[PDB]
Amino acid sequence: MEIRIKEIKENKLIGRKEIYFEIYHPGEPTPSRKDVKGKLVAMLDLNPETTVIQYIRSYFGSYISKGYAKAYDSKERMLYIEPEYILIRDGLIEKKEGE
């Protein structure tokens, strides 16, 4: 499996790079989030607990996955700002707030 960076945004106000991933799997099952943790910290080039994994869907039979990840400087900022699905998929926090 191979992770490549397609697209890079620089958001200054909050101090993060917003980043697009294409991840491959050829003859292999759908990418495994647990190895992708190990692989991520090097690709983004930021500490391991502030390099964040989000969004992947995986094509039907066409072996390419499209996806998004975050690289943050600020551990403080990230839990607060971000929409809850990310925080659980990375493993940070759950679901914020009920009724």
Which tokens go with 75? Answer: 């551990």
Instruction: Report the chain's C-alpha Rg in angstroms.
Output: 14
- Residue 12 near other proteins by CB under 8 A: yes
Does residue 81 touch other proteins according to CB under 8 A?
Answer: yes
Where does this chain touch other proteins (CB under 8 A) — which range of 13-21, 25-33, 37-45, 57-65?
13-21
The whole-angstrom separation of Cα 83 and Cα 27 is: 33
Structure tokens at 50: 């502030």
Short-list 80, 70, 76, CA closest to 17: 70
Tokens of 25: 């799997």
Smallest separation, CB 87 to other proteins (Å): 12
- Contact pattern from residue 28 through residue 67 relative to other proteins, giving x for each residue in contact according to CB under 8 A and a dash for the rest: ----------------------------------------
**Residues lying near other proteins in the complex (CB under 8 A):** 9, 11-14, 18, 80-83
